[PDB]
Design a protein around this nucleic acid. Structure first.
Ligand SMILES: [Mg+2]
Length: 596
DNA sequence: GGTCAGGTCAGGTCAG
């Protein structure tokens, strides 16, 4: 029931020195050259595609066309998304068997199963081992993007920060062979790093941490006031306040690191025992008071607040903060608006000084990330009217809220979609299920919420541009799914794709009706079912034109007619925004090419 | 057969 090959490096095996007796012995030539390659110092930067060429004999493929086929896969590995797969079927389908010298002697009907396992063998024992030999994959947490870094480069940074963390007494090496709970990892961010712990999956102790986590969330919702609902807080405050809003979003740097463990331990003990048993209280207290971590064959103690990566760290930091909130922000104007996440505070009032004071009140208590601070206060050095917060972009003047998109310039957008599922594999002769699973709704739902489609505080200018931006995204996902159909399913019948295409602009457009209509408000003008299906079909237009040659046929019949009149009842929806591509998505790389 | 309540999964958003 296994159709898929996973691209990621840790699926790699460790190469025998000699090839097994069911494999043809041209392979042993390759393994020998593999060792010779590893003994090369390789101080200077070198491409993997180039290094493999001088390892795998041309004599193994015969023709250059066969070889480029196999390089299309190495490149995919070198450019992989987390979880990305290919079909095992590609490893052999459509090859020029004639040109393969060592198969003339093997019966034709026997050849494809020899080539798949020989290509599996080369991929598992030579290609990934070598990539691993020179680099480390780190996941950027922008979608599933994985960046590869040179081992000499990463190691240097690792040791560099490790020495800092050893200087700053955050990490202290002791001698008791106390059990470490996980392995520390140093993963670089924008300017800093992130020290995190990977918990050894514990021996049936996770259920215990699940239980404790729920039990303290019960104390959070109880002895501490609710922090709002965000959608309702921003609804009410924009109605209670009619003048120019003033606001600030501040980003605390290292919320975990700046927790005072002692206080947290006193909060723990302070719980009523009908709520939290004294034994459990004490388990958390020496759990977070004794955080031990394995580095390079050494076990250290973590004492800078809470360990990112520990299962308790989240909820325990929540408790800490909720208690702080009581201390410092309970008395604020009732009319003003305030909402917090884990380390992101958003505060709005119609008076400049109340926000300015809030900035001071917060700075007296916390060390913040000053570059991350955003404000419309006129005496700030870079004031703005739009504040990013919580995955949304609030405009304090207009009071219109958009979705926030995390797509750096040259981000390869295929990294924002997990199209492969290894627990539920799709056949190579069933591309229809591979293009529909791509099209499941749940993936854009977080942009199909009361927040984006309501017309309570939102114009129609903005309830439109929202739905339009969401659909640009579903398009890019469609394009990535297509090139997975093209490059892994290898389909040439593009007739069973239009089905789910229009079969989702209908449901995709209709959902915006029930969700958009249930949250009507005083800026609601008039929206229309085919106004939405037309926005949708013009979004696909503006996107698909980026690979016009593969797609003009589909855009030819689309553009031709379709009644793209684009009449809008409001009149202040420019509608120019809909023809073309919103600036965010034009500068995203849609092609796949391994840099090194 | 038609609801609910609970459980799982999936892909996505938050945020460490
Ligand atoms: Mg933050």
């Amino acid at each position: 029931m296994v159709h898929y090959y996973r691209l990621s490096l840790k699926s790699r095996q460790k190469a025998p020195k000699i090839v097994n007796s069911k494999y043809n012995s041209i392979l042993n030539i390759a393994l020998k050259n593999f060792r010779l390659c590893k003994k090369h110092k390789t101080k200077k930067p070198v491409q993997i595609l180039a290094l493999l060429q001088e390892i795998i004999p041309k004599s193994y493929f015969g023709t250059t066309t066969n070889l480029k086929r196999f390089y299309k896969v190495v490149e995919k590995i070198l450019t992989q998304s987390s979880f990305e797969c290919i079909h095992l079927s590609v490893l052999h389908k459509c090859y020029d068997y004639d040109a393969i010298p060592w198969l003339q002697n093997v019966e034709p009907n026997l050849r494809p199963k020899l080539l798949l396992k020989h290509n599996l063998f080369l991929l598992d024992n030579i290609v990934k081992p070598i990539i691993a030999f020179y680099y480390k994959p780190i996941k950027t947490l922008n979608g599933h993007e994985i960046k590869f870094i040179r081992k000499e480069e990463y190691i240097s940074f690792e040791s560099k920060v490790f020495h800092k963390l050893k200087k700053m007494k955050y990490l202290v090496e002791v001698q008791d062979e106390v059990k470490p709970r996980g392995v520390l990892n140093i993963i670089p961010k924008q300017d800093n790093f992130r020290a995190i712990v990977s918990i050894f999956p514990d021996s049936a102790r996770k259920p215990f941490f699940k239980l404790l986590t729920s039990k303290i969330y019960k104390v959070l919702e109880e002895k501490y006031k609710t922090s709002g609902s965000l959608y309702t807080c921003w609804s009410e405050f924009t109605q209670k306040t009619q003048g120019q809003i003033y606001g600030i979003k501040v980003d605390i740097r290292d919320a975990y690191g700046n927790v005072k463990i002692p206080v947290l331990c006193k909060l723990i003990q302070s719980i009523p025992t009908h709520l939290l048993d004294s034994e459990k209280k004490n388990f958390i207290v020496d759990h977070i008071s004794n955080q031990f971590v394995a580095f390079r064959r050494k076990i250290y103690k973590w004492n800078h607040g809470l360990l990112q990566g520990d299962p308790l760290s989240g909820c325990l930091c929540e408790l800490y903060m909720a208690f702080m909130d009581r201390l410092y922000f309970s008395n604020l104007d009732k009319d003003a608006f305030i909402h917090r996440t884990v380390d992101d505070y958003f505060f709005c009032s119609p008076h400049p000084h109340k926000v300015y004071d809030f900035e001071l009140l917060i700075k007296g208590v916390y060390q913040v990330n000053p570059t991350k601070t955003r404000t419309n206060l006129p005496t700030h050095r870079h004031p703005q009217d739009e504040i990013p917060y919580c995955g949304k972009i609030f405009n304090l003047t207009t009071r219109q809220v958009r979705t926030l998109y995390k797509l750096p310039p040259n981000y390869e957008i295929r990294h924002k979609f997990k199209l492969w599922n290894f627990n539920n594999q799709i056949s190579d002769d069933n591309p229809a299920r591979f293009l529909q699973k791509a099209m499941d709704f749940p993936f854009i739902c977080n942009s199909f919420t009361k927040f984006e489609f309501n017309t309570v505080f939102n114009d129609q200018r903005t309830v439109f541009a929202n739905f339009y931006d969401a659909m640009i995204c579903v398009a890019y996902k469609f394009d990535a799914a297509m090139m997975a159909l093209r490059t892994s399913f290898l389909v040439n019948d593009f007739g069973f794709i239009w089905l789910v295409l229009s079969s989702t602009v209908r449901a995709y457009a209709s959902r915006a009706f029930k969700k958009i209509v249930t949250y009507k408000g005083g800026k609601y003008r008039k929206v229309t079912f085919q106004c939405l299906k037309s926005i949708a079909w013009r979004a696909f237009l503006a996107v698909l034109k980026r690979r016009t040659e593969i797609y003009k046929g589909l855009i030819d019949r689309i553009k031709s007619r379709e009644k793209l009149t684009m009449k809008f009842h409001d009149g202040e929806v420019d509608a120019s925004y809909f023809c073309k591509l919103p600036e965010k998505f034009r500068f995203v790389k849609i092609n796949r090419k391994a840099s090194i």
